[model samples]
Target: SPQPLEQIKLSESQLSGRVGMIEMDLASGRTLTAWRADERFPMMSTFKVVLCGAVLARVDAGDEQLERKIHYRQQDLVDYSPVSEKHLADGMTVGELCAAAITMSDNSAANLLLATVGGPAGLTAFLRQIGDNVTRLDRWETELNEALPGDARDTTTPASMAATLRKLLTSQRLSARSQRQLLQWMVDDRVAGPLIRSVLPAGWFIADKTGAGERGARGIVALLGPNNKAERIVVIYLRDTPASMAERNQQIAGIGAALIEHWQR
Candidate 1:
């Protein structure tokens, strides 16, 4: 049964356009949901987090090492990335690539890790084995616009994405060290955008990944740690928001701030 947040009411105007949001408190095992939370939407770069999990699973099985080296090639290079065009040189270790992929949202770095996981096929294999029908991991960031039209470009439901974080928070599929390392990677990740971290209070200690494109959508899945309470996993996804990015960004910020307030109540 859905126990609606009776104390927290967001009106129709407040929830303009398509919206999906979910928050889970690990301590109480309670879930909060609103509008389209179970529906699928284009995943965009949000799939990178899942990719990291797949990579970590191999690490736990002793098949891969973070210290292992990854060679950069022309094939790995893609536009909209400094790691591809300038920041990086000949080669980098597997761990370094993962750091850049998550922290910087570097396109080529993600592709490098994607290739190491046996490419898109490897990611989808993991997702399929886990029964994630919503996620596709179909293309690299650069290939997204042209790769899969509509919701085909690496899609996931708000519930599906939130479920992933909850599992990772307590899964044996990855080493405890790897799990902590991945979350820390996200906490340390920094990029310019009106993202999950962007609107939250300072020192809140949250780890998140943001995804957006010309596809007219924006999404974020976050693990929020507020000092006074148990850890929480929050997922918010919006599609076809108002035409203006700036306007939509402001909306994103307000919605995120409001959700946090709702949880605190």
Candidate 2:
């Protein structure tokens, strides 16, 4: 079995990147970890998930609002993504930006959210305040796009994100409404062709966010909702993938297929 899925998948040529994954059953409080689950990998857009948490934390502090408006220039529309393909309007609400950041995987939208919480340093400070030991938001997407080394970029461990997700449900940090808003934004029915966005078996819930860039630093943090049986969380991350985008998509789909089979059995 692929205890740490990356090594196993890479060994079999099922993947070309360093893979890290952690599966947690919330109901039973059981956990399974393999590979670099505890090591940091370039978070890339996955950092957006943390950014969402950071901003929502401000809301919990009575300092921010979902309706708060963030103004942007025409220049903010600098990246190409299916989630944020065309240039958007000049200003968007905090809630609206969070929606696109998770659901559409829009780079521009995520950047806007990043700015809301004071950029990388601000995000980093917030995470540390909340007891996050590994995830670091060191640079914006545009700066990371400049060919920096992975060690000098935004990064997170599988466990850090898993902890972040769990805190959303258990902590007094964010209100119930804030939790719902952030999670609702993460609902990806079809963002990237179903890595975690794909449709699932009957009675399954997928609230997930995907991250990808030239680094082939691709990953997903998904909440498998309670159905007729139980509730769990699945987190998968990859880096140093030298494969083409086409193959990456195909592979993640297959990985999803494998994940579902493993979960059901």
Candidate 3:
């Protein structure tokens, strides 16, 4: 008789700077392991995942066109962003903005998309309709000075996010075509700093986003495992760590890597 898999034990030292982790195996339909998966931490840039879902839903509803162009204004820029100071005189399409928002984690691109999609209120309604109850979008950034810790913003839980990703992957929530398109865009995402990207084996197909700030670092990684064994989703959120951002990120990556190794056996 096979023993039911209990929670995988991980060293606290190894996970010292980690806040949460959630992993689900699509092949076996199993939850591999988790810690503080229900705890809500500052979502940081991971909130963009909800934004991405909202954008796709609007496109599916025929309420918006992805190809529509959105002009960038100098006032929309935020500090510490690549797109902040640059003038987007050439203009970028709605689809392009979404891509940039996910792949590059572009603050300006996200803001533009948010505005076009009817801002935080629109996104919130869309998320609620999808049963993403734990996710909330309370604010949008228009300037660097306005971006503060106390400012109204969005947040999510690891479990809820994992469920959202699963819905998208299984086409259970969105149409098959929409799911395919969304995954394609996600796989091309540019923000690959930790969690999913650094932990998985080289050459494994991965699609994910990385978020970090004064709050902490977090990532949502969707993986196509070796030999097409299964698709796995890993969501991690961390906060209130004494380590530097770089150190904390490395620790997060290490936790993910350890999980992978544990499952491989």
Candidate 4:
């Protein structure tokens, strides 16, 4: 029954734009408050979070080695982002691929890792083990690689994402070292698009993952408060909005900043 920041309010402009927001206090493991938090949306690169978990789980099970190198095939290439191309040419170690997927949201790296982890179905099984019922993974076809986009690929609710972050934060399912490593990778994330990272205070440490597509965008943010006094996780999914991409991003950032301020007070 824990709640998000108490004084938070969405602007009329923000309300007009379809949005799903959730805030969870990691210390208490309770959602503070939420707006349309259960709504599902295309997870885009945010799906990498599950990929990370699956990879780590494999490592824990001794079925895979994080440092093992995987050869890259031409067909493995999907979308062509900057890092995507970089990852394809040199190939990548399991650890490096995982890092690339999270830090850069490299499509090629994601798909490669997805394949290594046993594809969509495998990743879904990992999610289920974590008690994540709201997140689902479909097939892997991509618009750039195929004649048409495959099935939905993966979907998640803002609330479920918040819960995932909480689980990661609490070290419920991973070793202390792995949990720290996972959060470190999230904090090291460098994708600077429309999401929580764009709006938080300069130098604030945010561990997060972002996802976006033609129809929607979502962000999951976990912060180790200014002095490390508190830990907070915030998730936002914006869909069906008339607002331009820039506008939607600004709203996400604004909401994140407001939540930080409220929690700090």
Every candidate's CA RMSD: 3.8, 3.2, 4.4, 4.3
Q: Write the per-residue lDDT of candidate 2 for residues 133-222, one digit (tens) a residue.
A: 787777776665332445745778888878877776456577888877776676642575354333466766667777775667677777
lDDT of 3 by residue, 1-265 (tens): 1111222133234445446667777555467776777866556666666677777777888887778877777776764457533546777888887777777788877888888668888877777787777766777763321224434356667787777677666745666766776777767776673445555677565677777755344455455555444467777766554566666666655665565556563
What TM-score would each prediction reach against the true structure? 0.85, 0.84, 0.82, 0.84
C-alpha RMSD between model 1 and the true structure: 3.8
What range of 10 consecutive residues in model 1 has the weakest lDDT sum? 1-10
Tens-digit lDDT track of model 4 for 16-42? 645667777777877776887887756
Candidate 3: 10-residue stretch with minimal lDDT = 1-10
TM-score of 4: 0.84
Task: Report lDDT (CA) for all predictions.
Answer: 0.68, 0.69, 0.64, 0.67
* 26 Cα displacement, candidate 3 (Å): 3.7
Lowest-sum lDDT 10-residue window in model 4: 143-152
Model 3 backbone overlap count: 1
Writing each residue's lDDT as its tens digit, candidate 1 over 1-265 gives: 1123321134224445566677777555467555567877777677778888888888888889989977776656886677655645558777877878778888888888888788887888887766666667777657663323345656778887777766665666667998887877777667633355456676565777887765457777777766633387777766754546675556556665665565554
Off by over 4 Å in 3: 1-18, 27-29, 83-87, 142-153, 193-200, 228-230
